[PDB]
Design a protein around this ligand. Structure first.
Ligand code: DUD
Ligand code: DUD
Ligand code: DUD
Ligand code: MG
Ligand code: MG
Ligand code: MG
Lengths: 158, 158, 158
């Protein structure tokens, strides 16, 4: 895992549209932004049918309904090198305040902002621009021979 | 963390019943399979009373109801060495499509397929054999003096 | 990540109010304890308004209602060094029995017990003193120049 100082050196290179204060003890606090956020309104039938989304204008705050999953675009944009990966964890502030998120990863070679899924256990809200996730940077044992080039490259929503 | 090439070398040794294409940038995509899958129908009273399960024939697709947790057996079988551990994360495809899963770990010394719990936020479905989780391989600072030999050894469901 | 033997050495130094038996293959099993546990009863409006909590006496067992998040104080107290961090994962026993928890982290420099959020998918219960989470210890590439000193220092609930 990369320390605070090691992450600080990633600013402006691996982590774009960053905030200096968001570099913590041993991770980076990802913020939610974007012109819109999405509410899943109908279940998915994977892999052929994706969940149905409701597009919502992201003004100042995102209003969430209990038992619904929401997709948010990160403020930060990534340009992952061939020797780094990131484990996306949830900030304990969101965890202890009734929000759920599964652990997911940003792969080496990935480029673009990320889209994170937050599920609300209660009717609640999150302020646009606030920090929601805690990124843990993992170093690969060797530069990967397979960089990311999947369907989400560039920050594709879903 | 192990890279793509390092994981590829684990095929047929640490990862059995594998798919070469499922070795990604810095992890392996676990698939759900098995003759049956399970729906938790009654809550648990831990540790004395486990949740009550409903056994379902796993034909072609698993039908999930909102607000229910389901147990799936992995296609892959594991034979973990004393110097490796695995962090089970959820594929972002499942995350952004309304599925929840908590982070869990496969310990050094563990042998057998794993049983993963996926919770559906919406009425939905998953296709038998599809990739649902992203495995991150962690190296222990030193070979562990305590290999796994717990109650789930061999791939015990619950 | 740290092996069983390496974790065992942290006992009485980094991990206080511990249990020898809880040092596993490659992690430590955190226990829930404390005089009280909390039920989130009203959603949060982050960051200005935290969720509303209901304080419950923690006698022998915590009774959980489906679709509710609960905050539990850990038995263990931490004194994190400048070169270590901890990934909090959920024990698979809780995962396969209908409990959800997001991945969260204990930062280098953090002092005190931790407060973990468990969400019940079903009406259920957890016994006081039982192991619920699996702690994975991560070593920082370098001693962090920024130790924890946030609002939760000392084990602040929320
Ligand atoms: O919560 C997340 C996690 C990761 N990603 C990005 C970065 C990662 O490199 C890419 C992975 O896309 P994929 O491998 O093609 O699909 P999956 O994550 O399901 O394996 O998606 C996100 O946008 N949000
Ligand atoms: O989602 C998971 C995670 C891990 N395991 C297996 C591998 C791991 O080594 C073992 C651990 O079982 P345990 O230590 O006996 O109980 P717990 O995971 O609750 O600590 O269970 C699973 O089958 N499913
Ligand atoms: O489930 C958790 C995770 C961590 N912590 C503690 C240890 C960690 O070092 C501190 C971090 O608090 P913060 O950085 O101030 O807020 P956040 O976790 O939301 O970024 O909280 C807990 O009590 N419970
Ligand atoms: Mg994980
Ligand atoms: Mg996790
Ligand atoms: Mg986790």
């Amino acid at each position: 895992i990369l320390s605070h100082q090691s992450i600080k050196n990633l600013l402006g290179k691996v982590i774009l549209n960053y905030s200096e204060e968001n570099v913590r003890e041993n991770g980076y606090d990802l913020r939610i932004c974007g012109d819109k956020y999405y509410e899943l309104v109908q279940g998915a039938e994977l892999p052929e049918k994706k969940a149905t989304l409701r597009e919502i204008e992201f003004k100042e705050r995102a209003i969430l309904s209990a038992n619904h999953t929401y997709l948010f675009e990160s403020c930060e944009e990534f340009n992952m090198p061939a020797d780094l990966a990131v484990l996306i964890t949830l900030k304990s502030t969101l965890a202890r305040n009734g929000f759920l998120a599964p652990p997911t990863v940003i792969d080496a070679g990935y480029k673009g902002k990320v889209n994170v899924a937050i599920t609300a256990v209660y009717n609640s809200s999150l302020k646009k621009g606030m920090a929601t996730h805690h990124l843990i940077f993992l170093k690969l044992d060797k530069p990967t021979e397979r960089l990311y080039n999947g369907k989400y490259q560039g920050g594709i929503l879903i």
